[PDB]
Amino acid sequence: HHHHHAAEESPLAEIERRSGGRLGVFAIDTGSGRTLGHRADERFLMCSTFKGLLAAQILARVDSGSERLDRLVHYTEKDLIFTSPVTKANVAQGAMSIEALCRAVLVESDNTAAILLMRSAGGPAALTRFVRGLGDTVTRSDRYEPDSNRYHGVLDTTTPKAIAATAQRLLLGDVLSAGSRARLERGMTDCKPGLNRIRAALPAGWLAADRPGTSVDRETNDYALVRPPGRAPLLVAVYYDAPGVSMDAREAVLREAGSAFVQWATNAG
């Protein structure tokens, strides 16, 4: 389908054209293998979406005995950076458990929690190696926040298709133990910063779990595991790179893409 747009992609192209910027979408029905995409193989900054992969890397270390959920990771005020509500709240205690840090990155995108987890586990290179071992040769983690939220060639990027496939492996592919897999999905279900993105477009009664990411000046992302009653789950990733568009308007684009996803999933996909 290289000469003409597929009809199923037209609504996504129209959302992008009406708002400006560059919109990447990929969705997969895990039962049938049917897919929906727009710019699905283009690179976008992950921003906090990397934290959904980081949490899985840490839980895989728990599974292998290289880490313990209850181990205390020590830190001080010198470690705190912006958007770190949980680690900031606990700094006087001087430590948080691995389990609590994983929950903080998934539920609140806690920035310092993610840096502390990376400190425990080998840094961006080890996160990249973790996803490579899952068969993802695209996604790469290279820097720490805040600099990892700034475009710099291919550093700290994924594609919508690659991260959706990796999310499917992590959540449905038997790469984590039953307990770790459930703990990953639980944190993503309880996640707060993405509730006005893909999940706001889903029909009442669909269960979903997501991981968002944002930069102040351009990037608004979300990926989700979507569980409609009575059918196989779906994965959907939406990455929006829109310099000069307000954060609220960028979330509205993600909701529009989410609605296009629901229409696709309920009629052809």
Side-chain angles (χ1 to χ4, degrees), residues 1-17 19-77 79-269:
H1 231 302
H2 303 286
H3 293 75
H4 306 90
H5 220 187
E8 68 178 20
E9 184 177 347
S10 300
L12 303 177
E14 186 62 15
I15 291 162
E16 177 182 70
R17 187 156 200 280
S19 276
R22 185 171 64 97
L23 179 65
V25 176
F26 181 79
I28 180 160
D29 185 318
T30 65
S32 62
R34 289 213 167 213
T35 62
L36 173 69
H38 180 68
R39 306 191 188 283
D41 300 291
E42 293 192 21
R43 284 185 180 276
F44 295 80
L45 270 187
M46 280 189 283
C47 297
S48 293
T49 63
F50 87 87
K51 294 165 188 166
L53 308 181
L54 175 62
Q57 180 198 357
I58 303 298
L59 297 168
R61 285 167 55 78
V62 170
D63 288 347
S64 70
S66 299
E67 189 52 272
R68 292 178 277 113
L69 286 172
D70 66 8
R71 184 178 69 88
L72 296 183
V73 176
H74 297 255
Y75 67 101
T76 71
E77 185 180 350
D79 296 297
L80 292 175
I81 66 171
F82 69 109
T83 312
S84 296
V86 189
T87 50
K88 178 175 173 181
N90 295 318
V91 66
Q93 295 283 107
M96 283 172 61
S97 73
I98 286 287
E99 175 173 276
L101 293 167
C102 284
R103 190 168 60 249
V105 305
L106 292 177
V107 177
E108 298 292 340
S109 308
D110 189 298
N111 275 328
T112 296
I115 296 176
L116 294 175
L117 290 173
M118 275 192 290
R119 179 189 86 190
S120 79
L127 181 53
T128 302
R129 269 158 179 184
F130 174 70
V131 305
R132 291 286 176 276
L134 302 174
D136 185 337
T137 57
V138 172
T139 300
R140 49 184 299 160
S141 175
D142 296 283
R143 295 169 294 167
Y144 294 100
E145 277 178 290
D147 194 49
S148 63
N149 294 316
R150 307 163 183 159
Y151 271 94
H152 191 296
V154 302
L155 302 186
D156 308 281
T157 60
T158 191
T159 65
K161 178 184 299 170
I163 199 160
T166 294
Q168 181 176 348
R169 193 103 186 269
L170 291 174
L171 289 154
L172 297 168
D174 184 45
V175 303
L176 293 173
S177 67
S180 287
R181 194 221 72 78
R183 173 166 286 104
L184 182 64
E185 183 170 347
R186 187 157 59 244
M188 296 176 66
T189 301
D190 292 343
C191 182
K192 293 313 184 219
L195 288 175
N196 221 13
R197 301 178 187 191
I198 297 169
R199 285 165 72 174
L202 303 180
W206 287 22
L207 177 60
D210 79 299
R211 175 89 294 270
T214 316
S215 77
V216 167
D217 66 13
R218 62 202 287 178
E219 192 76 31
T220 297
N221 309 326
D222 198 30
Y223 71 86
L225 175 65
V226 177
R227 298 183 178 280
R231 58 186 289 184
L234 304 96
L235 280 298
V236 52
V238 182
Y239 282 68
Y240 187 39
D241 174 9
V245 176
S246 72
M247 270 193 299
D248 279 356
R250 284 182 263 149
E251 293 197 308
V253 163
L254 268 62
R255 295 192 298 276
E256 293 167 5
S259 288
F261 158 76
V262 170
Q263 180 173 249
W264 167 80
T266 55
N267 289 284

